[PDB]
Amino acid sequence: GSHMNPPPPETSNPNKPKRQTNQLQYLLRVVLKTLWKHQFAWPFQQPVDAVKLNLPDYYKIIKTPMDMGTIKKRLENNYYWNAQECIQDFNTMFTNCYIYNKPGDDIVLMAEALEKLFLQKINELPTEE
Ligand SMILES: CC(=O)NCC(=O)NCC#CBr
Fold first, then answer.
1. Which of helix, strand or coil describes residue 5?
2. Whose CA is nearest to atom 2 of ligand 1?
């Protein structure tokens, strides 16, 4: 895409050690699946195109971009070693939304709804087996 957007986060790297754990399986089959199909998922399903949105300061402010499309691909590609790396990606995504936007903005209300659902799902994350 545009040279004015940054390259998206890595989803593949043969040098990075990888594992499938029951927790990671849960994060794909339950957590991502639940959030991905939510009414409010669409702003989070791909990286922010700051050019298309006319937000030239977006990647001045957000230095750690993350989106659910990247998380989906990481999970599908078995990119992670553990669940905490994936949880951290979700946390980063929500925090970037809250940093860039204002309390009560539509996208923040959407993020808050998804984050509540995320927290409920993580409360049920199984012990690593
Ligand atoms: C995904 C994310 O961080 N959201 C940012 C975003 O698109 N804001 C639009 C405006 C205004 Br105040």
1. coil
2. 97
Among residues 93, 104, 95, 1, which one has the least CA distance to residue 43? Answer: 93
Instruction: Assess if residue 7 is contained within a domain.
Output: no
Alpha carbon distance 113, 49 (integer Å):
23
Domain hosting residue 39, numbered range:
22-124
Q: Which among 49, 52, 35, 59 has a CA at the least distance from the CA of 111?
A: 35
Q: Which of 100, 105, 114 to mutate to test the pocket of ligand 1 (most atoms within 8 A of CB)?
A: 100
What is the length of the chain? 129
Which among 40, 50, 34 is positioned nearest to 112, based on CA atoms? 40
Query: If we measure between CA atoms, which residue out of 15, 56, 39, 14 comes closest to residue 111?
Result: 39
Residue 33 belongs to a domain? yes
For residue 13, being part of any structural domain is answered with: no
Report yes or no on 90 lying in a domain: yes
The count of domains in the chain is 1
To one decimal, the resolution in angstroms is 1.1
Residue nearest to atom 1 of ligand 1 (CA): 97
